[PDB]
Amino acid sequence: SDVFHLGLTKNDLQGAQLAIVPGDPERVEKIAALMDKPVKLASHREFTSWRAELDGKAVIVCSTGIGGPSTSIAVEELAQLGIRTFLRIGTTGAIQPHINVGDVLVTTASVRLDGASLHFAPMEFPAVADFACTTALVEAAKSIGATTHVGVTASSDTFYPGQERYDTYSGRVVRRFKGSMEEWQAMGVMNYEMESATLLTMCASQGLRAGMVAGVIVNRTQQEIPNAETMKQTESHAVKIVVEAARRLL
Amino acid sequence: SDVFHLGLTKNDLQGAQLAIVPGDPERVEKIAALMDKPVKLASHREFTSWRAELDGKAVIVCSTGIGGPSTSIAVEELAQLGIRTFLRIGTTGAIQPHINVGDVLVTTASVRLDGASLHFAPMEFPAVADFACTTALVEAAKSIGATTHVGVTASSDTFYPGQERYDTYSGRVVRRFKGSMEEWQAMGVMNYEMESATLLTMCASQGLRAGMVAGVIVNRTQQEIPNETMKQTESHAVKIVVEAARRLL
Amino acid sequence: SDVFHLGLTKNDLQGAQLAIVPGDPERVEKIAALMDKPVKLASHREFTSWRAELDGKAVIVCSTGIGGPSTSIAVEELAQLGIRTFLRIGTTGAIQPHINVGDVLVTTASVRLDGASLHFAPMEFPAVADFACTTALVEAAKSIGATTHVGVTASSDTFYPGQERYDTYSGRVVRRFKGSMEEWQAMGVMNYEMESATLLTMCASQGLRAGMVAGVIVNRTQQEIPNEMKQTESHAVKIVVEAARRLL
Amino acid sequence: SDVFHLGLTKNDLQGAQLAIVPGDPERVEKIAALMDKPVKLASHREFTSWRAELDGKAVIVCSTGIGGPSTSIAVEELAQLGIRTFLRIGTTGAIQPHINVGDVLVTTASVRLDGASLHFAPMEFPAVADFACTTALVEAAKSIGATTHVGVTASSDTFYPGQERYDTYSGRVVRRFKGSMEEWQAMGVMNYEMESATLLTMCASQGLRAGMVAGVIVNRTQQEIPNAETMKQTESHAVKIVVEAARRLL
Amino acid sequence: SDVFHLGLTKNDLQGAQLAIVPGDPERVEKIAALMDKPVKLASHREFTSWRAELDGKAVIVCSTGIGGPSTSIAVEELAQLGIRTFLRIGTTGAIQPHINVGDVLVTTASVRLDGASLHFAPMEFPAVADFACTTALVEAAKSIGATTHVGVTASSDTFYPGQERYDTYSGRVVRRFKGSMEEWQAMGVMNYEMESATLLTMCASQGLRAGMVAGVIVNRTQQEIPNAETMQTESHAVKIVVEAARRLL
Amino acid sequence: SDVFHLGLTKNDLQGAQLAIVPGDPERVEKIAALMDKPVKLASHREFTSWRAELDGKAVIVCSTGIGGPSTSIAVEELAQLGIRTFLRIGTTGAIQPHINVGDVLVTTASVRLDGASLHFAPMEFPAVADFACTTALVEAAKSIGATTHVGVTASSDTFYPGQERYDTYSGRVVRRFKGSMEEWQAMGVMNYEMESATLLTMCASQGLRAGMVAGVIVNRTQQEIPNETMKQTESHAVKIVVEAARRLL
């Protein structure tokens, strides 16, 4: 193997320079299945990688696991392998009242509430998306007619206290994050997720292009935990546009 | 008049919802000269304001002065008067070897080396431009014709030590900024300016739209102090910001 | 079905109080197999979970994935289900010339080079392991007679720049971490790993007991590539299982 | 010109080593009018400069514009031109109930609510005024006849949120500055202005002497809002004092 | 004299490698009295030293005074003279209701609410006790049948605001420490003291072994006042720290 | 008796409003011996107190001990008993080549290299001396013909690493303080001491007046062997602080 964690060689990518990167390893197959000639490559830890084709050119689907650390491994080793463009597709909790579950959110930049981003650039540096990648994602969403919101995302290193969840074992939230939800909301932040900050920072500061899109699974102005179903075709809207966006970026 | 610093009433804007915000008060007139019905409004401190017309729509040109603090004043007070879209036209110093004098740089987001941005959002918040504003700016660059680069800019509260300039009185730079320029360069940061961090942070965190464009007047990998410049380079970037404004009405 | 990520219930745990938390989903089965009545419970994302028994007492084995974010989810949801004791068993890179590959490292407290720990307590709070858990781990290592070092661990949010690696895509390390490995060496830090700061902080801040043990797979000073990590892993797997036995 | 922004040459200074540095470019002439043989030198951007004579010695008056960034350029470039001593005359908002409109305030040191000071010294460094300059201003105030208070100032990078003003477009103040005015009030801080922290730090950390005086145009604990008396007697009062102070620093 | 403050030489230690380090200089003798051949060494400022023998080996007892800055001088200059193990014995105020007077507290690690800590290691570094030292203290505590609590201690640079006391001159607490006791209580912190964060951090980062035991004098949450005497518990913690020293020689 | 640590009552102060605050307990009597009706008050820990008289007004002399934590206790409890003005007299190490052994340094404000100051005010707040106290001290120093320097001083929570001394057990200094002395020198910082940051911050932020004067006992740039020099230098500063106190009653 050419890399330590993913168990891949450069030949496995077959010249691919773009990668679609979900959090869940179990979604890699699902996304590769929407493209031509899907071929499984490897599965190690939380890193499941598939190869596929789009307009005759090769593309990589590869999971990152939850959080910046595992993402930082995935992106780095993938980049050592020849990928220059990364498109994250994820699930998200919306913090604005008008955003409906199922909607697609395109991230221009992220509130760095993580730790891995600091390992690539100091906090002054913006966790900003690539312009071509964001453009491709916005245009893809329009040519599909999906309810799309585009703006700032709060990217947290936890699922619970960092996203101000109170339905927990302790039931408390550290000072830093007490009332932080209503603050991001007043600041026009759309949503919470867990990988965009580190992904966006590490790419923007290393000459790599990155885009970020997610489907809403819960609205946090209403509840902390969703009940709604997951595996049908509802959040496939975000998946369809990330594949369509990948087309334009080849 | 309705606001503390700008000497303007809400009636002065005539329904205007977009402002173009140059740093230099003397360039306000030049920008207005490229639009229909340019009328001088007010001149107070570093805040020179003109009103104009684009395609039957009112537009404001108002200077901000150098730096986030006076920038934060102009924007706030222009927002109180009804402005919701801000386009900054400035001058800049390229950090990358491949970016030449005359080039047009559009800012997607900026490195926050300012203090005023902290007065609207904590440091983890991105100093990010509005997507529609950036789009129009990039699209306007194609229209006018310009060698254009798009990306991250370092927005400094100082012209000298924050941009690691050594042509100074002291000849020294504080620890935080020792070797900082070639660190920004390695991170792909394209230029140094002085207002974008404040403008972008304050707008994006307050539901206002903002965009940033600038003409390069010096390349730092070869010189510190800039050295014909504005005569054509300013007019160039100005034509772009005006064209971008058309697309945002 | 109760907890959102793990897909587990109170009942699946069978009144278990202790959980062993490796980073690798593949190591979960291996650890549970060393105990009595091993039974798979669930597998979602990077969280694969098993139940087993030590001396008639139910014990959970649940992976965390790589990093503090995924660790934090696992520990939290396990706590909702009744787990009060957490034992991490991991792999690590030694940064002291006298700690070679195959050695066992017990962490007293961690250098907090993560982000998730700050979501539970401010940086001034120590990322410290529970005393009973640490005691159990040291004693179990002596019981099998392993080469054991006890001390502080640098817990990084990245495998590469945070642990000061230059053999990368860009080859650069941000100012904060430039020369940092020499600093940790000078300060007597034993090793780099990627989950302890989050685990130890969130547990010490919430009334949970936690201990950290790791087998050395690489030494950051030496010029040597892995030889049987497999020998080291199953070795440390015995220590953590034997430690859990004392904590029930 | 010898400098990039200011449009001034060393000859323009005529051997001057003292600068009076108001915020407002329109005040430059007013200040120079209290001295002998005032002549306009230059006007560029926010930087309007005048030369005048005080007790036979050459003295520069030069505007800084609002904020630390503008101040940092002016002071740097004046220093390049030969200036060693800087006197700030400004307007301010008093925050203590006992300090009235029309009072004169001399700053010994400032709370650094700016970003430009960090470009000259870390936060732990004091934004402290030079002893001689401060002495000259205390004596001048007493020589002119004024109600004078001496102490700590809050130097903010914003007029609004950093000074906890709420009647704004957004109506909100960022966490950092929520209840901040009440805290500074409890800490004995007497006023808000916008350039002392930058000026005091960059001078004290570079062997330059700096002084800070301001006239109270508003009190944040009172409902009464003056006048024309803002730019009126109060402004004129402080201007007389700064000129009188300059006489003792030649 | 070999060192700047303590007024001691290498010879004065007689090959001692362990030091017991109380806060109060008045307590140094009492501790040394429990051991063989107690002899005063020196007394300068807040640092009063005594030498004793324990099971044949030489042992130093030396005061640090109040706070990290003085502690860092004692520990530094003692280390220069050949001291490798440091054991802190003090008195403390419990912040947890279940902790009563007469209870002993062993500190595994400390909350770094001090300043001197940062002069040895960045805030990221844990203010952690040495394992052998901690084990020894818990064993020695158990061997005298003491009610022992093991865990995290909050180490403050101040007695008043950093421990969130309002019964003061100003009656105010700075933002940082406003509501901070409730937070530490929720996080399971046992008590406040003023010297551990410095001792633990500087030792754990320089290859020196450190540990801390403390007797509870008062409780910040309990109504009941200490009896005919406060400090019965005083002599126990001293006996504990002396007994722990034995296992570490 | 009215306080927890100092062992004083308001009655002991006899309506005193100014205190002189050295670090060393032994200097307390010496400062008092230059005034009228000097009398011992109390001695607990590193807090030795004396009351004297000057022009019919009671004056307190009280030791703080080494460091901010110790100082914060003394200053707080003195303030509870009625002291409003605090004058610190100390020994110091100059870092400027132009500052010589035996020179007299008056502190306008201090670099906050401490932790205790943060317990009273956030880092943005200046550790500044009161103007009247600074004036009195400068005015007092010229009256007896001292060679005087008036400026900023670095106030460190450690004697060693924070003042960037390398002749230590470990021989190392944290990144934060590597090359820090050279940077303070370039910034115009006069000297190193260990109490002013805490004293000045807590006084300036609580409506208390404070100042500091010190005498130079070592220069960190050259090898001037410390000769009686400490004796004569201390005597001159002690005279200065008492003469300054006279002007503040």
Ligand SMILES: O=c1cc[nH]c(=O)[nH]1
């Ligand atoms: O609420 C949510 C949903 C998905 N991912 C998150 O981080 N938060």
Ligand SMILES: O=c1cc[nH]c(=O)[nH]1
């Ligand atoms: O170099 C430059 C040029 C213009 N503006 C800046 O801020 N820097």
Ligand SMILES: O=c1cc[nH]c(=O)[nH]1
């Ligand atoms: O070097 C290593 C080996 C394992 N895990 C790490 O985090 N680093």
Ligand SMILES: O=c1cc[nH]c(=O)[nH]1
């Ligand atoms: O409130 C005020 C008044 C004048 N200047 C300021 O900076 N603030």
Ligand SMILES: O=c1cc[nH]c(=O)[nH]1
């Ligand atoms: O160098 C010195 C001398 C005296 N006091 C200090 O703190 N440092």
